[PDB]
Design a protein around this ligand. Structure first.
Ligand SMILES: Cc1ncc(C[n+]2csc(CCOP(=O)(O)OP(=O)(O)O)c2C)c(N)n1
Ligand SMILES: Cc1ncc(C[n+]2csc(CCOP(=O)(O)OP(=O)(O)O)c2C)c(N)n1
Ligand SMILES: [Ca+2]
Ligand SMILES: [Ca+2]
Ligand SMILES: [Mg+2]
Ligand SMILES: [Mg+2]
Lengths: 97, 824, 824, 97
């Protein structure tokens, strides 16, 4: 994992699953063509995006109904740090460098 | 009118809102009743202060009272006898409420999106789904979600749901969390009757909770006592509730109903009646009535004799909240309050969700044929999801962009279900040692220090210790020997029925009562502890039931489903009253395995036998259980000896098979001196489905002398044997069929082959010709074994429309006629 | 604390007594609970005046409140939603009561003398009467007497009693007025289950009233809906109540109960639920619970989950009066108040008589074994008669001479019963004309002026007029042709069930609803008037039932008993739900005639047939009704044609025989184009218990070509006939058995004899091998007709534990397998 | 009926029955040996007596529990006149000359 990040599902029906962040934009949502397919009715078809620009990893809500949280705090966009918890619907994902 | 008069009028006005404000609350989303919406005070008193301890203006008292009792929630609580329960409700209902956060409102809207997209898909994709439509009642989904979330907020272990068919697949997808690939695997269906389990995760909290759905027939409300038994077995396993080390009752029953069935079905009142009983309580049930103000084509005025469909819940002083189904925030708020009440007081709460049924009852039904006014009003109603989205915009709670996000989310859910299903379409020994028998005998005399035994009970205790060591073990002790040894082996044994602790025929004495202090002692509970003091893991849970058959049998069936490892026995006072539980027998016990794959090991003990005590004290209707039977559905027996009953029970509890057992048990045969067993029959034998006379197996009897074979079952064997001994008739043998179903074809054939000189074979029974085993045996035995039973004849009472004559004199004449025919 | 505070505290104290005073009332004659017996006011406020509109001292408010709510009467009424009903009770309970006259006190004492002398005789003369003992509850006799007297004071026609066994012979002698020569004719007995009638004469008034007692099984509470049906039939006959010209409801139900059964049996709540329904109300029932605070060996804490055994009555907002059984004046006063309430509001009243059970439950029962504390208290209790005599002396109400007169009277009653019993020991066409058919067709288009018919209902009305004149009469119209012609002949027809007005399968339309105004029109009601305008004496009473099976079937059975001249039909939504009424079927319908000589002509309509809709939408359990049958008990049929169903119903209503009829009715066969009848089949035929194919009776069919005979019943005939016509199979004939019981032995033999070349005979059925007619026919047909059926084989679905498979696909495969076997 | 009287049951289970008064004392009660046997639990074993002395006919209560009435009025003893109604328990008897 050179310059890449990892998302590990800590809470949700697929707890233990790992998603690699290494592309410029990584889509997260209920659409089956999502890069990170999060299959729960609480997740919107198009929900969030993990954007990698330069060195920083950012989470961005793209118009979901239930929003996106970073460490129990609602955000429109937030720069992610090692060990941060991202909530997308009922799913809880840990961000790791 | 002075200040004193004005003060009195304010206090009475406060009491009127608390008591009867619910009668004026805006609970009906259809507003069908136009005429729906103390007076010593006027406009001049609005700004006058009154003692409430603070002084408050009348206008402030009125706004609090109106908001609490006359908006979208009708509160009924002043009928509650416990003042602490009235205060608890009053304080939570009269306080200023904190508006939900935007995130909570958006989450409720996300649940309306999920419920409506599911309904839209269901009604568009398939024909014949109109009868299960949740359209007009979608708010039940955020309501149930709030119940389960509030249970998770209390850190509870599981929520178990029972419900009728309406919206069941919507509940599977949006509450239980089952995927569409499992829900839409076939093409109403068995899917509306099956059980399911899932995991609920809190959206805003840190906990998870298990969510399950029990199986049920189409018989509305029949599952209600089954759910309670299932929950109670799960609570006993988790060491929670009545038989647990904590008072959390951490398995919650969530019971759904329809408005017409909730008022009309007697099993509802029978199940409510169980709510605080020691043997049956589950710490309070959360009820939801989907009150669509219709029952197929029937108006509520033809379905009930009271203001509300939930009025039967006043039978147990439960609080009742009538809530407007078009207000999902009030619906979710009432759900959370219901769970908090249930946790604080361990008592049922009833939620009356007022809603409507958008469609006709089924396909081809235009409901305006019988309810034109209701359906002209429904045709103008906008959906719950659109109305709530519009309410949120108008209130400024959400922006137009956020409302667009919600519509986007909705269309995405609609696309998801339509596309997923599219792709799915194109793709052991029963014998114990002498030491075990002696220990169970000894336990009856191992009384607590200073215990005073009733003088009539003392000989029973002493006779049991005597039987354990010397033999001549009677039926009542053999039963306790079987249950006691299972407990010593670590099994949980639950035994209940009407007066079952003492026994109807004063024969059991499973619980004994101190003559001076009323203190109870349970001798078999001592077998839950090994001689070294370590627990065996076993337990004896023995209770006196309520005077119910339907709810009591339903509870025991559910209990056995909830814990397949428990030994569960229900006992009828007399088998003649079990027809009161016919719906449970037909819909769950005899058929649940074949219909739903749901297994039960429940035992039914049915006192049976012709003794001249009338048509309601003679028969358990053997013929009806035999008719219900099909290969592998149930085991049906009528043992004639204490030891064979012992082996039957031990086999049932130890075979590792989940299959109901029906036992036709004795009454006078409990004290028949010939119906006793030897120690050896418990230590050196097993269950015998077919028995011979002890003169052929143990004595000097000659089977080659036999020319007439009498086949029978039950207590008549002893009378047949007494006549045989008195008349010294070596030419006649008596064979007993102990296991009535499955017919023991192989053992029967082997037994009959030991009598090579039989010229004539008769089936002998006490029951009328159209009753007992003859209607099935008479037809099946010649077909199944033609070399043994072609020519088999019947000896019985004449065919009757009742199980017996009402006259004990006629009984005696008929009984003597059967013996005289058998040896004629 | 000022005057304002003191005033507020008094108003709340008044509300506390009205609401909860009953919780402190001295209602228990045993005083078992030691701990049984607003506070801002003190001793200093006792002589302070408070507004009540008069000013009253606190001590006076308190004495009125304490006398009204905290003495020997516990009043529950503030749960009642109607304020006029709360005011009515409050005014009668809070007023100063006029002490009874000496003559009224002496009369009550004379009823205690009669009750105790009867009990003393019963317990001394016979063994096995302990289980029926009224000892400790004798006050129920002056209580019931006061009920009946108060009904006579209102000039009512009859009081009909339903009760369990406890004190039944005491009620026969001292309430119904039956002589001891009739009561003690034989040597519990059938006497505890039989019906009886008598005349009650007022002691102090000028009126007489009829008093009857209905028959019942041992099943506690099962009779409750039966009593209501019986009373409603009697009210309809007297032109009183709901279907009468007066609002007097002049036939009163008096329903007795036990405390454990009243709380535990679901049929109680089902019957209360009927109390204000248009189709079932009887103008309010008077309930008496004999509350002896025990149920066999079971304590009330194991029998109910609420404070009182009567709490289920809150389901309908009924007032409840808990009264001390040791105060016969308060017991008689509550009884009179209950009748006055019932008359004013036409709603149930519940009397909870607190008493005790002096003896054990039965012979050989020492009740101190399980309830030592209760029975140590009971052993110190003096009887009601002695305590009341002693109360009257102490109060100075009666002299010592008058008390001696009472003891003299008592001994004389005791001598009378002992001596009397001592001396007793030492001593028509069913066819109608074309004009009748046309008139019933025309009635469907004889709409009231400006009536708006629903557009989906209009073709049904027009098709019926068309069928009446042109033929091809379907099943739904043939039923209305049968009911309509009986009404025209002057018969009362009562038809009810779930959604029965419209019909479950949208086929009946017995009631039609105006599209614009919701107004109802009943076409068959026009047949109650002759063409000349004179009434025929007939009537059509058609209702939608509550969502109940047990109480609904029990009501229809009781209705048929109450009026043997009425045509009474109950309809199951699907036959699969009738098992919910199994207790009524087993205990009353199938067996009441043989057990009690009680006759009923009730009809059960059970929708039945294998159509792939699952195990709860397929079967009425024909096999269970056939098993219950015995010669002359019931008629059981499964007609295959509309005209044969018409003749069956007309025969049933016109035969002058009172015998229940069980009909297995169609679902898809209602709209089967082959299942239609000609005009001639109604005008020129009769009921045919056995039918042949129309090719042999009307066509050019050759019976001598037939080598294979298929015997069947129901809708499968049409599928068997369709396959026969398609395959042109002259070698196979199909015979239908329309009347399943009594088996039509003679007609069957005559029909089979017209096929001399048959080599093989098969019984064909849709039902599993252990279900349908095969289990009884398979056994009875070869025995009854050995020259016709020896060798009879079966063609059916395989034996199952449920009435069918849950899969419609499996159903279709199995259905095709039966036809393929039949023509293989 | 020379110097005799008649009692006719007007209300009671034996309505229509007639009893002749021509003896010095005529007993009325629930005892089967009563001259006038009035079979109802409301009537005492020994209840009343119809006494004929000289020309007057008298009714006398002999210690019954429910008493004796003459024209709806309770009496210990009363001289009877033609057409008077005597109540003994639930029975109503008309006295005729
Ligand atoms: C015990 C029983 N009797 C009859 C039926 C037939 N049935 C199916 S739906 C229905 C009406 C249900 O009314 P309600 O309880 O208000 O529920 P809804 O369908 O309106 O949700 C009836 C009588 C049944 N399924 N179970
Ligand atoms: C439906 C039914 N179940 C069971 C019985 C058996 N049984 C007879 S008496 C009795 C207890 C009755 O208790 P309660 O109703 O308080 O009446 P009590 O005998 O005390 O007057 C029972 C369970 C019955 N007769 N009917
Ligand atoms: Ca087993
Ligand atoms: Ca008839
Ligand atoms: Mg409904
Ligand atoms: Mg009782």
């Amino acid at each position: 994992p050179s310059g890449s990040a990892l998302l590990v599902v800590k809470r949700g029906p697929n707890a233990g699953s790992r998603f690699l962040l290494d592309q410029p934009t990584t889509s997260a949502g209920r659409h089956p063509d999502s890069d990170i397919f999060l299959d729960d009715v609480t997740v919107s078809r198009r929900h969030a995006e993990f954007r990698l620009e330069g060195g920083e990893f950012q989470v961005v809500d793209v118009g979901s109904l239930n929003g996106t949280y970073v460490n129990r705090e609602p955000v429109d966009s937030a720069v992610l740090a090692n060990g941060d918890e991202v909530q997308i619907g009922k799913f809880r994902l840990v961000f790791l460098t | 009118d002075s200040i004193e008069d004005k003060n009195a009028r304010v206090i009475e006005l406060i009491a009127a809102y608390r008591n009867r404000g619910h009668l004026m609350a805006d609970i009906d989303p259809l507003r069908l009743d136009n005429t729906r919406f103390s007076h010593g005070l006027t406009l001049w008193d609005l700004d006058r202060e009154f003692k409430v301890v603070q002084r408050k203006k009348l206008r402030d008292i009125l706004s609090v009272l109106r908001d609490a009792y006359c908006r979208h929630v009708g509160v009924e609580y002043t009928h509650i006898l416990e003042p602490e329960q009235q205060r608890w409700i009053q304080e939570r209902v009269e306080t200023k409420h904190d508006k939900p956060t935007v995130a909570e409102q958006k989450y409720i809207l996300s649940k309306l999106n999920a419920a409506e997209a599911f309904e839209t898909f269901l009604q568009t994709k398939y024909v014949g789904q109109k009868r299960f439509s949740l359209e007009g009642a979608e708010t039940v989904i955020p309501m149930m979600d709030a119940v389960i979330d509030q249970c998770a907020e209390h850190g509870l272990d599981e929520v178990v749901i029972a419900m009728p068919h309406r919206g069941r697949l919507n509940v599977l997808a949006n509450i239980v969390g089952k995927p569409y690939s499992q829900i839409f695997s076939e093409f109403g269906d068995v899917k509306y009757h099956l059980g399911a389990t899932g995991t609920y995760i809190q959206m805003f909290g840190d906990n998870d909770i298990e969510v399950s759905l029990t199986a049920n027939p189409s018989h509305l409300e029949a599952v209600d006592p089954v759910l309670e038994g299932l929950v109670r077995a799960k609570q006993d396993l988790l060491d929670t509730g009545e038989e647990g080390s904590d008072n959390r009752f951490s398995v919650v029953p969530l019971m759904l109903h329809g408005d017409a069935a909730f008022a009309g079905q007697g099993v509802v009142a029978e199940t409510l009646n169980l709510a605080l009983l020691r043997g049956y309580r589950t710490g309070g049930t959360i009820h939801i009535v989907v009150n669509n103000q219709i029952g197929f084509t029937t108006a509520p005025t033809d379905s009930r004799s009271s203001e509300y469909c939930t009025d039967v819940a006043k039978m147990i002083g439960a609080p009742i909240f009538h809530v407007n189904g078009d207000d999902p925030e009030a619906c979710a708020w009432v759900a959370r309050l219901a769970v908090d009440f249930r946790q604080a007081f361990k008592k049922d709460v009833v939620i009356d969700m007022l809603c409507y049924r958008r469609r006709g009852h089924n396909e081809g039904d235009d409901p305006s044929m019988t309810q034109p006014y209701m359906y002209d009003v429904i045709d103008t109603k906008r959906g719950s999801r659109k109305a709530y989205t519009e309410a949120l915009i108008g209130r400024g709670d959400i922006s137009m962009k956020e409302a667009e996000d919600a519509l986007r989310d909705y269309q995405g859910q609609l696309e998801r279900v339509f596309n997923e299903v599219r792709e799915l379409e194109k793709h052991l020994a029963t014998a114990v040692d002498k030491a075990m028998l002696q220990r169970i005998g000894d336990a009856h005399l191992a009384l607590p220090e200073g215990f005073t035994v009733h003088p009539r009970v003392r000989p029973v205790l002493e006779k049991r210790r005597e039987m354990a060591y010397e033999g001549r073990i009677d039926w009542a002790f053999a039963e306790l020997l079987a249950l006691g040894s299972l407990i010593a082996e670590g099994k949980l044994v639950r035994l209940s029925g009407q007066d079952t602790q003492r026994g109807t025929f004063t024969q059991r004495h499973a619980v004994i009562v101190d003559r001076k202090t009323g203190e109870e002692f349970t001798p078999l509970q001592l077998l839950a502890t090994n001689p070294d003091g370590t627990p065996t893991g076993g337990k004896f849970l023995v209770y006196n039931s309520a005077l119910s058959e339907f709810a009591a049998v339903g509870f025991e069936y559910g209990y056995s489903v909830g814990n397949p490892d428990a030994m569960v026995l229900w006992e009828a006072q007399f088998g003649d009253f079990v027809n009161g539980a016919q719906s449970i027998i037909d819909e769950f016990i005899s058929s649940g395995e074949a219909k739903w794959g749901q297994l039960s090991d429940v035992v039914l003990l049915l006192p049976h036998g012709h003794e001249g005590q009338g048509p309601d004290h003679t028969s358990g209707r053997i013929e009806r259980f035999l008719q219900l039977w099909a290969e592998g559905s149930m085991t049906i027996a009528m043992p004639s000896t204490p030891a064979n009953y012992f082996h039957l029970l031990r086999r049932h509890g130890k075979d590792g098979i989940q299959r109901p057992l029906i036992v036709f048990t004795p009454k006078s045969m409990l004290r028949n001196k010939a119906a006793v067993s030897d120690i050896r029959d418990f230590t050196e034998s097993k269950f015998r489905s077919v028995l011979e006379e002890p003169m052929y197996t143990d004595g000097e009897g000659d089977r080659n002398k036999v020319t007439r074979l009498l086949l029978t079952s039950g207590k008549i064997y002893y009378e047949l044997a007494a006549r045989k001994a008195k008349e010294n008739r070596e030419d006649v043998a008596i064979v007993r069929i102990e296991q009535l179903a499955p017919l023991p074809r192989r053992r029967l054939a082997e037994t009959l082959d030991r009598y090579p000189n039989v010229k004539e074979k008769f089936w002998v029974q006490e029951e009328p010709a159209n009753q007992g085993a003859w209607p099935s045996f008479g037809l099946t035995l010649p077909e199944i074994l033609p070399d043994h039973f072609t020519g088999l004849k019947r000896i019985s009472r004449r065919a009757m429309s009742a199980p017996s004559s009402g006259s004990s004199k006629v009984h005696a004449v008929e009984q003597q006629e059967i013996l005289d025919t058998a040896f004629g």
